[PDB]
Design a protein around this ligand. Sequence first.
Ligand SMILES: NC(=O)c1[nH]nc([C@@H]2O[C@H](COP(=O)(O)O)[C@@H](O)[C@H]2O)c1O
Ligand SMILES: NC(=O)c1[nH]nc([C@@H]2O[C@H](COP(=O)(O)O)[C@@H](O)[C@H]2O)c1O
Lengths: 214, 214
Amino acid sequence: VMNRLILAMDLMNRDDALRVTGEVREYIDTVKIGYPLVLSEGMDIIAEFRKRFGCRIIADFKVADIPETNEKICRATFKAGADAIIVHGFPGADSVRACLNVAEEMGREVFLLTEMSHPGAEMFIQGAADEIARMGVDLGVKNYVGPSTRPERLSRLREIIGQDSFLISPGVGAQGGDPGETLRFADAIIVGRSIYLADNPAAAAAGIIESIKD
Amino acid sequence: VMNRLILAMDLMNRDDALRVTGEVREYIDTVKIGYPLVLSEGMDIIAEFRKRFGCRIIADFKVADIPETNEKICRATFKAGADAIIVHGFPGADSVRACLNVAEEMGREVFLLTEMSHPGAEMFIQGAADEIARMGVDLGVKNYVGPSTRPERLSRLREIIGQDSFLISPGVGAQGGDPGETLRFADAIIVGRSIYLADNPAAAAAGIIESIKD
Ligand SMILES: NC(=O)c1[nH]nc([C@@H]2O[C@H](COP(=O)(O)O)[C@@H](O)[C@H]2O)c1O
Ligand SMILES: NC(=O)c1[nH]nc([C@@H]2O[C@H](COP(=O)(O)O)[C@@H](O)[C@H]2O)c1O
């Protein structure tokens, strides 16, 4: 991804979301769109962003249901124009396979969520994370998400998934993660509030990019 | 809930979803609406269903993100008119508390997802489920979801949450669960495909209701 930086666009109104994305588009060609924006403005926002910024879109929908429902969610998301979808591994292999099957049908990509970045991740996810990642490998998953806030965990994850898997990492900035340290292990970093709540988002994005071209 | 039966409306087009819901409304006053319908037809479908059927709406959005994002998702969902939202416990206590905080603000309800009904639930969720339920109790969660397909697990869950907590249970019919057995432990059963894919959904709902008035 351009500059190894993915914008997490979690503003909840279309005008603000369009403005910030336009302001930072010269620094970022991949945008992660989640339920805060989609549930506020509708699924058509995905095609609109694709048409107007010519950016890749990762739908961060944390898909976490039974296989049959996961199938439906993925089909609707790809129909809406998303390039990739983010899915939870905690619900098990059949749930993940359901998403992979639809991605195969539609010529799209699935990212598998291993350990999460927030404090509560320590309670249940952290203990299962290595096994979730190994499940991913055994299902043929090639794209993974792991936590900027715990680089020792991001190292262990990289160790499991190998160097050819693609790894993106949220929790940079607002949640306490560091761009440079995270990029020792991840291929790209995801950044939301540090950019979109900044007084000057373009300056925020530019600062991040200069701190990692080093 | 009327007749202890909640319709899971996972058809993905508004015309079919409206038709089936109208056909079964005399048997069911609570409808569970999930992402298959919302991502296909928009969040406005929730208010439309509320206006036209005068039914309670549980938004089955399996909320499973970090606290800040969970907050946003819950706010958008309640703004859309949902009476309750279903949230995952696996991401930990802070993620769940974020949902509870918004529900408190908005005068709404959170249901906590313990163990899931599908085969893959055995991999990671089942081993954490008792602890997720105990976390729920310690956070003051009063509404829970547990699996029709494993009544021994539904019994253990009821044991943890006590008799005053409200417990709803999916996996009835299509996934193999039995209405009567499930209702030994759950307060209400959730039924999707057994009703909405039936040649006569009203007859399907009626058959279920006669098999549990007994
Ligand atoms: N899997 C994880 O560890 C994880 N941590 N955060 C996110 C998501 O990534 C984004 C982080 O945003 P900001 O903190 O503002 O930079 C936001 O959309 C959040 O919901 C995520 O998927
Ligand atoms: N937590 C769980 O154990 C669990 N199992 N199924 C569902 C959801 O409940 C519904 C079950 O639908 P049908 O099988 O057709 O009767 C459907 O929306 C599915 O996604 C669920 O939340």
